[PDB]
RNA sequence: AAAA
């Protein structure tokens, strides 16, 4: 009959409240979720949506009481709303975790509760989830409960509490290009993996920019219409010896011919050691069926698979579960809002690690992709997520970019990490060292 | 004697401490800056850099007391540090603004100071700077003074307290392209301005894609090497069916001819009513003297000047001073770090408004520039800065991009705003309404 | 300045 209540403060970061809730839920009879009301006149949005998500993914059910605060910036109104709305019941223990919310929410929820339950029959406890060392810290108690490895969360819960829905991703066994290149994907990927393991990555991306991209990427729907692709071919042919066609035919290294000749016969860009030039009477659907998937894969997607295959090995040696804690081609939306696409996600405990991939060696483009991955991981995983960008740049540029985009949040470990071309051969070990540390 | 001390908690956002420090400085004799020490074992960085900037730009001098904390997540270590390091002098008033720092800093600094001084009939007060409605909220006096229009800050001190240095920007009177087109820039910009205010912006940017960019953009230094340009032009001529040269001569709207003819004769892209083709007598220097500056301005730099010219008069009416509170092409670095450039900066009170500009109508490029301006205003202005991205996209893409990149921080006012092609003619009022209302 |  002795009721114990846990109190959480619902800010705009639901993850710490999920973690503290997951750890302490079994020891408490009631839960008071203190959230903000929506008042446009004071520029105050509501965190009720996060409070609902916390109730849903913690299975609080009837034990949950929602307490709205009219003004989360004004002490006088916080205290008034607390006296009016805080549950007036016989509690034998009141535990406030003051991790979330505004500063004035924290001090005045703390002191209101410590005063209302000063009777020694009622034990008051205050706790705080330290984001830097992953520890639940109790007030006036040396107790330091590390929750880094004990509390776990899957990608679906993590995105759901951050208000994202329609979560889709691919597995090692459901990778899309495995279907598009039947009976050959392993041969293609092994040939590509062998080349990257042989320090041929820079040679590969150089050939991909010139002459690959100058031939197969020049217009919006170039590879969708045989006439436009043939027109693009004739224009290049006019550049004579210096044409990309000649460099493709005459200056393509053997390891790149082997990669091209691993694709299925009906989906090869080459006829022997010569660029397949479509003739007239080639249907647009015949051209697309032969070059669309092959060009799109050779145009960057191969690197998403390569890095994913290097990570999956070492992640399975650990406790990670594919689909719940890592995956490829993550996509989701907020309601009535555009979708995003994240290359690779990894969850180490309850920390999201989003990984953005590119073969580009250009500072400007890699920089923009650096901004992109930083904003995405905070949208879907909260403000303590880590962003990793894997580029084709050399060591000097990756260190430059890392310092360029570094933002200070009070921790000593970087939340934005950049890898470059020299890390491709052992990219699995590099990620494992950076993530699990 | 009769000493009144103000206490500030130094987190990773120095701006609220600067605003509270500027507002209350004249009324307090001593200032206690409570900051964190660096300890990589507990993944805790130090905010001493911000504390030093706060002492410098508030001109506290020997009235400033630095109070270091060893562990900002540990209730006990916080109190031990407070007992041993807080000034032992007799104070008649102790005012603590608890806006910054961790939640455990806020709780245990508040309750420590409250017991030490409010128990002695000494004036103890606590305040909190509301980020959403720009109000300094007092706990005991129950006051909430709006500092929105009373506290000011300049781009130099704003960037400095956020640890940025080497701050450069251009004035209206020092705009770079005013030197490239002396005696002609006004005519050039006024002709472009008249067209954009006539809703010709969409037609202009489509012409800039084709055939302008098809003709004057290609290999690096295309417009500075006559052989590169003339060979490139001969290739376009062989595509006489869909030649950009034919489209230039025959399909160019009259308002663009007026723009092209607004340039000085030696810097026109047109020879009369057709494209100027360099003869073999034209040297590399003549070609660059005629075309290089004109093309770069028409390629998008004109839009930077246009937007800046549409707001400058309205900013001066609001008593904002150029250079301090607004400017164009802001550049700065962190120590030994790459520079950034921001097209336009604006400061309303103490909120930074960073404005990124592009004539592009493509989703992906505008999206990548959206991530960029969001991060940059965060780095140089703190977590409450506003980011505006002005694009050449239609209204549907503009609304999509806002929702795509929106991030929840607790306010009802959007801090990422996107404008599109349909906003160009009235961009001065659109910005003025978004920023100051 | 709503896990500093
Ligand atoms: Mn991708
Ligand atoms: Mn990618
Ligand atoms: Mn300088
Ligand atoms: Mn620019
Ligand atoms: Mn720009």
> Rounded CA gap, A405 and B243, in Å?
42
Which of A38, A36, A28 has the alpha carbon at shortest distance from A7?
A: A28
Q: How far does Cα B437 stand from its chain's mean position?
A: 18
Rounded CA separation A437/A129 (Å)? 19
C1' of C3 to CA of B154 (Å): 31
Secondary structure class of A152 (helix, strand, coil): coil
Report how far apart, in Å, the C-alpha atoms of A433 and of each of A314, B266, B423 are: 11, 60, 48
CATH code for the part of the protein at B3-151:
3.40.50.10770
Q: Which helix (H) or strand (E) holds A361?
A: none
For the four alpha carbons of A379, A381, A382 and A384, in that order, the dihedral sign comes to negative
Nearest 5°: phi and psi at A6?
Answer: -100, 135
Q: Are B34 and B109 in contact (CB under 8 A)?
A: yes
Q: Assign domain B167-171+322-436 one CATH number from 3.40.1190.20, 2.40.70.10, 3.30.1550.10, 3.40.1350.10.
A: 3.40.1350.10
* Side-chain-facing half-sphere of B17: CA atoms under 13 Å: 32
Question: Considering CB atoms only, which of A103, A338, A379 is closest to B99?
Answer: A103
Give the containing element (helix H, strand E) for A195: helix A185-197
CATH 3.40.1350.10 is held by the domain A167-171+322-435: yes
d(CA A16, CA A8): 10
HEC sequence for B318-335: CCCCECCCEEEEEEEECC
Q: In whole angstroms, give the CA distance from residue A123 to residue B188.
A: 76
Q: What is the DSSP string of A253-298?
A: -HHHHHHHTTS-GGG-SBSSSSB--PPTT--HHHHHHHHHHHHHII
Is A304 labelled a binding residue? yes
State the ligand closest to the CA atom of A368: 2
Q: Which of residues 195-224 of A touch strand C (CB under 7 A)?
A: none
Q: In a 3-state reduction of DSSP, which class is residue A20?
A: helix
**Residue A127 approaches strand C within 7 Å at CB:** no
Do the domains A167-171+322-435 and A3-151 match in fold?
A: no
Q: Give backbone dihedrals phi and psi of B177, rounded to 5 degrees, phi first.
A: -70, -10
Q: How many other C-beta atoms can be found within 10 angstroms of the C-beta atom of residue A358?
A: 21
CA angle at residue A256 from A225 to A279, to 5 degrees?
25
What's chain A's length in residues? 437
| A4 neighbors A91 (Cβ within 8 angstroms) | yes
Q: Which of A429, A377, A371 is nearest to A401 (CA)?
A: A371
CB contact under 8 A, B132 and A36: no
| Cβ partners under 8 Å of residue B102, min gap 6 | A128, A410, B11, B72, B73
Question: Contact, A188 vs A256, CB < 8 A?
Answer: no
Can you tell me the distance from the alpha carbon of B156 to that of B380, in angstroms, rounded to the nearest whole number?
A: 10
Contact status, residue A301 vs residue A184, Cβ threshold 8 Å: no
Nucleotide whose C1' lies closest to the alpha carbon of residue B73: C4
Q: Quote the tokens at residue A139.
A: 């007030």
- The long-range contacts involving A132-137, CB below 8 angstroms and separated by at least 24 positions, are A132/A410, A132/A411, A132/A412, A132/B42, A132/B43, A132/B44, A132/B73, A133/B42, A133/B43, A133/B44, A133/B73, A134/A349, A135/B73, A136/A20, A136/A23, A137/B73, A137/B74, A137/B75, A137/B104
Question: How far is the centre of ligand 3, averaged over its atoms, from the C-alpha of B166 (Å)?
Answer: 5
DSSP β-bridge partners for residue A5: A30, A94
Phi-psi region for residue B60, left (φ > 0), alpha (ψ -120 to 50) or beta? alpha
Q: Which helix (H) or strand (E) is A144 found in, with range? A: strand A144-146
Q: Name the resolution in angstroms.
A: 2.2
Tokens of A44: 């105050």
Which residues numbered 318-357 in chain B sit less than 7 A from strand C, measured from CB? 350-351
Interchain contact B48–A (C-beta under 8 A):
no
CA angle A38, A44, A50 (to 5 degrees): 60
Q: How far apart are CA A209 and CA A190, in angstroms?
A: 22
- Picking from A423, A371, A355, the residue whose alpha carbon sits closest to that of residue A395 is A423
The helix (H) or strand (E) run that includes residue A161 is helix A155-161
**CA separation for the pair A303, B308 (Å, rounded):** 42
At A330, is the secondary structure helix, strand, or coil? strand
A78 and A107 in contact (C-beta within 8 Å)? no
Measure A374 CA to ligand 5 centroid, in angstroms: 20
CB A287 within 8 A of CB A278: yes
Gap between the Cα atoms of B377 and B355, Å rounded: 9
Q: How far apart are CA A23 and CA A97, in angstroms?
A: 12
Task: Say if residue A253 is exposed, middle or buried (CB neighbours under 10 Å; 0-12, 13-18, 19+).
Answer: middle
Q: Nearest 10 degrees: CA dihedral of B249, B251, B256, B257?
A: 40
**Cβ pair B245, B251 in contact under 8 A:** no
- Helices B226-238 and B284-296 pack at an angle, to 10 degrees, of 70
- Domain borders along chain A are 3-151, 167-171+322-435, 182-301
The full DSSP string for A206-246 is HHIIIIIHHHH-SSTTGGG-HHHHHHHHHHHHTTGGGSHHH
Sign of CA dihedral B292, B295, B301, B302: positive
Question: Which letter, b or e, does each residue of B196-234 get, where b requires 16 or more Cβ atoms within 10 Å of its Cβ?
Answer: bbeebbbebbebbeebbebbbeeeeebbebbebbbebbe
Q: Nearest residue on chain B to A39, judged by CA atoms?
A: B412
**Separation of alpha carbons B425 and B437, rounded Å:** 20
Distance CA A178, CA A172 (A): 9
Residues 6 or more apart whose CB falls under 8 angstroms from that of B3 comprise B29, B30, B89, B90, B91, B92
Residue A154 assigned as binding residue: yes
Residues whose CB falls within 8 Å of the CB of residue A265, separated by 6 or more in sequence, listed in order: none
Cα–Cα distance measured from residue A283 to residue A229, given in angstroms and rounded to the nearest whole number = 12
Cα(A364)–Cα(A377) distance, integer angstroms = 21
Are B372 and A367 a contacting pair at CB < 8 A? Answer: yes
Tokens of A92: 């034998």
Distance B278 CA to C2 C1' (A): 62
Closest CA to A294 of A302, A285, A286: A302
Spatial neighbors of B313 by CB under 8 A, at least 6 apart, are B428
**Alpha-carbon distances, residue A146 vs A135, B46, B70, B167 (angstroms):** 4, 22, 19, 43
C-beta of residue A394 within 8 angstroms of C-beta of residue A422? yes
Q: Indicate yes or no: strand C within 7 A of the C-beta of B411.
A: yes
Q: How many CA atoms lie within 13 A of A248 on its CB side?
A: 25
Distance CA A52, CA A39 (A): 18
The 8-class DSSP code of residue A37 comes to: P
Which approach determined this entry? X-ray
What are φ and ψ of residue A425, in 5° steps? Answer: -65, -35
Q: Which residue of B has its CA nearest to A110?
A: B107
Report how far residue A355's alpha carbon sits from residue A377's, in angstroms, rounded to the nearest whole number: 9
CA distance linking residue A91 with residue A99, whole number of Å: 22
| Strand B339-348 with B351-357, pairing | antiparallel
Angle at B66 between CA B61 and CA B70, to 5 degrees: 165
What's the CA gap between B391 and B401, in Å, rounded?
10
Matching residue, tokens 């006088």: A76
How many separate helices (H) and strands (E) can be counted in chain A? Answer: 17, 13
Q: What 3 state SS string does chain B have?
A: CCEEEEEEECCCCHHHHHHHHHHHHHHCCEEEEEEECCEHHHCECCCHHHHHHHHHHCCCHHHEEEEEECCCCCHHHHHHHHHHHCCCCCEEEEEEECCCCCHHHHHHHHHHHHHHHHHHCCEEEEEEEECCCCEEEECCCCCEEECCCCCCCCHHHHHHHCCCEEEEEECHHHCCHHHHCCCCHHHHHHHHHHHHCCCCHHHHHHHHHHHHHHHHCCCCCCCCCHHHHHHHHHHHHHCCCCCHHHHHHHHCCHHHHHHHCCCCHHHCCECCCCECCCCCCCCHHHHHHHHHHHHHHHHHHHHHHHHHHHHHHHHHHCCCCECCCEEEEEEEECCCCCEEEEEEEEEECCEEEEEEECCCCCHHHHHHHHHHHHHHHHHHHCCCCEEEEECCCCHHHHHHHHHHHCCCCCCCCCCEEEECHHHCCCHHHHHHHHHHC
Rg (CA), chain A: 27
Measured in angstroms, the CA of B43 and the nearest CA of chain A are apart by 5
Could you say which DSSP state residue A190 is in?
A: H
- Distance between CA atoms of residues A420 and A427, nearest Å: 9
């Amino acid at each position: 009959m002795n009721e114990k209540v846990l109190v959480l403060i619902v800010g705009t970061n639901p993850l710490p409240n999920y973690v503290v809730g997951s750890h302490l839920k079994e020891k408490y009879d009631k839960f008071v979720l203190i959230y903000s009301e929506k008042n446009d006149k004071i520029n105050q949005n509501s965190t009720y949506d996060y409070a609902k998500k916390l109730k849903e993914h913690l299975n609080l059910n009837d034990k949950c009481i929602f307490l709205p605060l009219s003004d989360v910036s004004n002490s006088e109104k916080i205290i008034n709303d607390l006296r009016e709305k805080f549950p007036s019941e016989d509690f034998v223990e009141v535990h406030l975790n003051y991790t979330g919310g505004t500063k004035t929410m924290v001090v005045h929820i703390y002191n209101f509760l410590k005063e209302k339950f000063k009777n020694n029959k009622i034990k008051f406890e205050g706790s705080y989830l330290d984001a830097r060392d992953y520890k639940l810290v109790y007030d006036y108690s040396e107790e330091a409960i590390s929750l880094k490895d004990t509390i776990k969360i899957d990608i679906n819960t993590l995105l759901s509490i951050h208000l994202y829905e329609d979560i889709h991703f691919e597995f090692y066994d459901t990778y899309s290009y495995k279907q598009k290149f039947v009976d050959s994907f392993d041969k293609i990927s092994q040939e590509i993996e062998k080349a990257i393991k042989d320090d041929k990555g820079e040679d590969f991306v150089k050939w991909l920019e010139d002459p690959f991209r100058k031939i197969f990427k020049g217009e919006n729907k170039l590879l969708e219409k045989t006439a436009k692709f043939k027109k693009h071919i004739e224009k290049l042919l006019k550049d004579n010896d210096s044409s990309p066609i000649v460099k493709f035919n005459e200056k393509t290294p053997q390891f790149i011919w082997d990669i091209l000749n691993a694709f299925p016969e009906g989906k090869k860009l080459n006829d022997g050691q010569k660029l397949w030039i479509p003739d007239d009477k080639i249907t647009n659907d015949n051209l697309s069926s032969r070059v669309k998937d092959t060009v799109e894969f050779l145009n960057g997607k191969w690197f998403e698979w390569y890095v994913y295959s290097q990570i999956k090995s070492e992640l399975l040696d650990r406790k990670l579960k594919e689909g719940e804690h890592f995956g490829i081609s993550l996509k989701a939306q907020k309601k009535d809002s555009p979708y995003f696409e994240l290359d690779i996600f990894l969850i180490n405990g309850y920390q999201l690690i989003g990984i953005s991939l590119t073969t580009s060696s250009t500072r400007e483009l890699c920089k923009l992709k650096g901004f992109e991955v930083i904003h995405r991981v905070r949208q879907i995983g909260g403000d303590e997520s880590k962003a990793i960008l894997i580029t084709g740049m050399d060591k000097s540029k990756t260190e430059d970019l890392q310092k360029d985009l570094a933002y200070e949040t009070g921790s000593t470990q970087k939340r934005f990490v950049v890898f470059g071309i020299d890390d491709w051969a052992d990219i699995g070990s590099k990620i494992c060292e950076e993530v699990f540390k």
